Design an enzyme around this catalytic site. Structure first.
Site, PDB file in Angstrom:
ATOM      1  N   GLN A 179      15.902 -77.838 -30.455  1.00 61.84           N
ATOM      2  CA  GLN A 179      15.126 -78.920 -30.359  1.00 61.84           C
ATOM      3  C   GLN A 179      13.716 -78.782 -29.619  1.00 61.84           C
ATOM      4  O   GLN A 179      12.724 -79.205 -30.005  1.00 61.84           O
ATOM      5  CB  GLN A 179      15.942 -80.217 -29.906  1.00 61.84           C
ATOM      6  CG  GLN A 179      17.002 -80.751 -30.780  1.00 61.84           C
ATOM      7  CD  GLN A 179      17.713 -81.988 -30.285  1.00 61.84           C
ATOM      8  OE1 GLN A 179      17.604 -82.188 -29.104  1.00 61.84           O
ATOM      9  NE2 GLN A 179      18.689 -82.506 -30.908  1.00 61.84           N
ATOM     10  N   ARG A 193      34.378 -74.897 -20.440  1.00 58.24           N
ATOM     11  CA  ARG A 193      32.874 -75.163 -20.198  1.00 58.24           C
ATOM     12  C   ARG A 193      31.870 -73.912 -20.690  1.00 58.24           C
ATOM     13  O   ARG A 193      30.804 -74.244 -20.820  1.00 58.24           O
ATOM     14  CB  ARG A 193      32.559 -75.326 -18.588  1.00 58.24           C
ATOM     15  CG  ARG A 193      32.259 -74.128 -17.723  1.00 58.24           C
ATOM     16  CD  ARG A 193      31.633 -74.636 -16.324  1.00 58.24           C
ATOM     17  NE  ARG A 193      31.035 -73.610 -15.980  1.00 58.24           N
ATOM     18  CZ  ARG A 193      30.359 -73.680 -14.735  1.00 58.24           C
ATOM     19  NH1 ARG A 193      30.473 -74.826 -13.820  1.00 58.24           N
ATOM     20  NH2 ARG A 193      29.803 -72.552 -14.261  1.00 58.24           N
ATOM     21  N   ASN A 250      25.352 -76.517 -26.127  1.00 59.63           N
ATOM     22  CA  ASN A 250      24.218 -77.553 -25.606  1.00 59.63           C
ATOM     23  C   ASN A 250      23.098 -76.767 -25.526  1.00 59.63           C
ATOM     24  O   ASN A 250      21.898 -77.083 -26.022  1.00 59.63           O
ATOM     25  CB  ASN A 250      24.568 -78.122 -24.322  1.00 59.63           C
ATOM     26  CG  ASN A 250      25.297 -79.533 -24.697  1.00 59.63           C
ATOM     27  OD1 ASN A 250      25.289 -80.284 -25.572  1.00 59.63           O
ATOM     28  ND2 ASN A 250      26.261 -79.730 -23.821  1.00 59.63           N
ATOM     29  N   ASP A 284      21.371 -94.098 -12.428  1.00 60.44           N
ATOM     30  CA  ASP A 284      21.840 -94.314 -10.952  1.00 60.44           C
ATOM     31  C   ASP A 284      20.958 -94.817 -10.263  1.00 60.44           C
ATOM     32  O   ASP A 284      21.479 -95.774  -9.344  1.00 60.44           O
ATOM     33  CB  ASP A 284      22.227 -92.777 -10.702  1.00 60.44           C
ATOM     34  CG  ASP A 284      23.314 -91.982 -11.539  1.00 60.44           C
ATOM     35  OD1 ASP A 284      24.422 -92.774 -11.613  1.00 60.44           O
ATOM     36  OD2 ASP A 284      23.312 -91.055 -12.031  1.00 60.44           O
ATOM     37  N   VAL A 302      18.363 -87.455 -21.988  1.00 63.91           N
ATOM     38  CA  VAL A 302      19.585 -88.589 -21.690  1.00 63.91           C
ATOM     39  C   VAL A 302      21.008 -87.726 -21.797  1.00 63.91           C
ATOM     40  O   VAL A 302      21.863 -87.945 -21.134  1.00 63.91           O
ATOM     41  CB  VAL A 302      19.381 -89.631 -22.519  1.00 63.91           C
ATOM     42  CG1 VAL A 302      20.534 -90.839 -22.243  1.00 63.91           C
ATOM     43  CG2 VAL A 302      18.037 -90.275 -22.339  1.00 63.91           C
ATOM     44  N   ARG A 309      21.977 -98.790 -10.643  1.00 66.78           N
ATOM     45  CA  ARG A 309      22.991 -98.924  -9.971  1.00 66.78           C
ATOM     46  C   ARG A 309      22.749 -98.923  -8.472  1.00 66.78           C
ATOM     47  O   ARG A 309      23.651 -99.869  -7.769  1.00 66.78           O
ATOM     48  CB  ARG A 309      23.937 -97.718 -10.425  1.00 66.78           C
ATOM     49  CG  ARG A 309      24.609 -97.938 -11.559  1.00 66.78           C
ATOM     50  CD  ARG A 309      25.436 -96.526 -12.344  1.00 66.78           C
ATOM     51  NE  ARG A 309      26.144 -96.931 -13.364  1.00 66.78           N
ATOM     52  CZ  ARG A 309      26.556 -95.745 -14.300  1.00 66.78           C
ATOM     53  NH1 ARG A 309      26.277 -94.357 -13.936  1.00 66.78           N
ATOM     54  NH2 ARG A 309      27.272 -96.015 -15.013  1.00 66.78           N
ATOM     55  N   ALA A 358      23.063 -92.327 -34.137  1.00 65.50           N
ATOM     56  CA  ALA A 358      24.422 -93.153 -34.682  1.00 65.50           C
ATOM     57  C   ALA A 358      25.181 -93.278 -33.563  1.00 65.50           C
ATOM     58  O   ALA A 358      26.352 -93.888 -33.808  1.00 65.50           O
ATOM     59  CB  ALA A 358      25.066 -92.200 -35.911  1.00 65.50           C
ATOM     60  N   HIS A 416      21.774 -85.294 -12.397  1.00 67.74           N
ATOM     61  CA  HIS A 416      21.999 -86.370 -12.632  1.00 67.74           C
ATOM     62  C   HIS A 416      23.493 -86.841 -12.609  1.00 67.74           C
ATOM     63  O   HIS A 416      23.641 -88.004 -12.628  1.00 67.74           O
ATOM     64  CB  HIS A 416      21.624 -86.351 -14.379  1.00 67.74           C
ATOM     65  CG  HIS A 416      22.470 -87.509 -15.270  1.00 67.74           C
ATOM     66  ND1 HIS A 416      22.422 -88.882 -14.932  1.00 67.74           N
ATOM     67  CD2 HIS A 416      23.273 -87.099 -16.198  1.00 67.74           C
ATOM     68  CE1 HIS A 416      22.929 -89.306 -15.744  1.00 67.74           C
ATOM     69  NE2 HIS A 416      23.772 -88.832 -16.527  1.00 67.74           N
TER      70      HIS A 416
END
Lengths: 327, 328
Positions: free
Chosen positions: B112, B98, B105, B159, B129, B162, B13, B187
């Site tokens: 998952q 943090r 996370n 990146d 991602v 880019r 979403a 990343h």
């Protein structure tokens, strides 16, 4: 290709344009061998957002995107255009009635029509998206008397695609198994999604959608109502208006102009009604079934109109006549 | 037509996914002859927005989209998957320490990974991602022992793209004309955008030799690429979803169909057995070639002194991240 084409998108800092620009830049609309100069217009306070959009387009590393220009001035925006996708318009806010939405936007599209008339190529194709689509298109066309009236179209392809999906979902087939639905008339509540001439492949055989469903009352009641209210239903779910599906519909609409309608199919497009054979007043911007070859549309002639269809096509013609008189 | 493949997008979403689902549905990622069953996962509060996303996907009238499943349950989302694109992670709220973010996370991607390990095909390809992409991907891989570690990758293609765009810009050439840039390592932040092995057609010449400006390539080019996402967010104030979704498509396409002849691409992959002095058991962006859906390291590239320092520093960032997160 010999030369890049200049394609303008207005409302370019908004949500519909955000879902549309990549498909233009990557070759999926105008062809994998067609370079594009992309021109983006929006209001002055949105120019900072638009620089971010230029940065993202750069970061997609698209070989066909020869240049991207961001502007808030019509002289820059409309210079030498081959295509103009007119997405920017004033939204209907709380408190304003339908008349106020019309009044707000007539001035916008009379000005963009004047800019087209003065700055763009005379061969420009103008596709009008921002609402009220048909009347905004007519306004611009009348203010661009040097551009052929046939070069102006307005977007009913989103309603068309929605009608296809409802048929495909009811009958249990893929989207490509349905064809020749029609959106007649106004991109509004009075649009008529007509399936009297539509076909669906069912057991390897093509059949009419009426015959396939064996449920006329659904097709003439709930089906119509669902397509008319679909936009409000999406707004209610994601708290935003459609952008992905509206951009996909713009892609279909422009691609069918650029390349032509597929063999055995016609599509729905708002076009100038002059000379139609379906009892619709002349000098309306009204959605008809068309076929397209060499970037020139043509009315689908000779479709039989039953009495239910006659009543629907006239009601939407009336609403468009009344919007025109307001403008 | 091929049989449908089941493809999951999490965070379905959110902004990135909103820019991604069409490209998956219209055939441009997995091929024009490959029907798709699209599985969409997000948190329960997003279920209402997710149903409006489902309505828009129907309204695109996409022939290859056999079905679209929207769900907030892992046992539904991960069943029989061929591809899992893990976009959703915990975003950091203002004033969030943090330690709390790393715990949020780790919890997400441990769960998952366990769902991948129990419900998906053992051949599933997993592309991570959501930030911090590399450490999130490693977490899920370690939580999915039955899935080959080589099936996990994380996104540095944004990146990479880019970097390609900045080279082509500086040499006045089109994007199609630069190849073999490399993003090494993490990343974000410490990523090393390396053009020592990159070519450009002017015909085919090295980038260092074409540009003749060693300090810009080692200085402004590097910081421009490292800071590009922060610059886009400053300007748009919202996501960088359009170019991130394009990059995801490029990444998954190159897995599905392979890299072109003479070209490699940047992919975060498990570092085991690399010959570049990077610690093992890291998820680290390397140059890779891909054939038959299987990547392999591009080996034997000469590493000069400057590159060695850049590759060691991002390795150090990843090592510290891995130690910190695995306390949870």
């Amino acid at each position: 290709m010999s030369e890049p084409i200049r394609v303008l998108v207005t409302g370019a800092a908004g949500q519909i344009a955000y879902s549309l620009l990549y498909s233009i830049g990557n070759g999926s609309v105008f062809g994998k061998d067609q370079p594009i100069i992309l021109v983006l217009l929006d209001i002055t306070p949105m120019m900072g957002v638009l620089d971010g959009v230029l940065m993202e387009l750069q970061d997609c590393a698209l070989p066909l995107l020869k240049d991207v220009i961001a502007t808030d001035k019509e002289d820059v925006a409309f210079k030498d255009l081959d295509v103009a996708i007119l997405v920017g318009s004033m939204p209907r806010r709380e408190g304003m009635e339908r008349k106020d939405l019309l009044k707000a936007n007539v001035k916008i599209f009379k000005s963009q029509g004047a800019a087209l008339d003065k700055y763009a190529k005379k061969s420009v194709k103008v596709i009008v998206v921002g609402n009220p689509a048909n009347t905004n298109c007519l306004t611009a066309s009348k203010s661009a008397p040097s551009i052929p009236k046939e070069n102006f179209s307005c977007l009913t392809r989103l309603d068309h695609n929605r009608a296809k999906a409802q048929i495909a979902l009811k009958l249990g087939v893929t989207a490509n198994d349905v064809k020749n639905v029609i959106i007649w008339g106004n991109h509004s509540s009075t649009q008529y999604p007509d399936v009297n001439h539509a076909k669906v492949k069912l057991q390897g055989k093509e059949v009419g959608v009426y015959e396939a469903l064996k449920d006329d009352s659904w097709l003439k009641g709930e089906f119509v109502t669902t397509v008319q209210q679909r936009g409000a239903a999406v707004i209610k779910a994601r708290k935003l208006s459609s952008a992905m599906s509206a951009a996909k519909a713009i892609c279909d609409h422009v691609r069918d102009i650029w390349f032509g309608t597929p063999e055995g199919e016609f599509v729905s497009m708002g076009v100038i009604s002059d000379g139609n054979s379906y009892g619709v007043p002349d000098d309306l911007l009204y959605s008809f079934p068309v076929v397209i070859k060499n970037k020139t549309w043509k009315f689908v002639e000779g479709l039989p109109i039953n009495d239910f269809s006659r009543e629907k096509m006239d009601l939407t013609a009336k609403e468009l006549t009344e919007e025109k008189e307001s403008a």
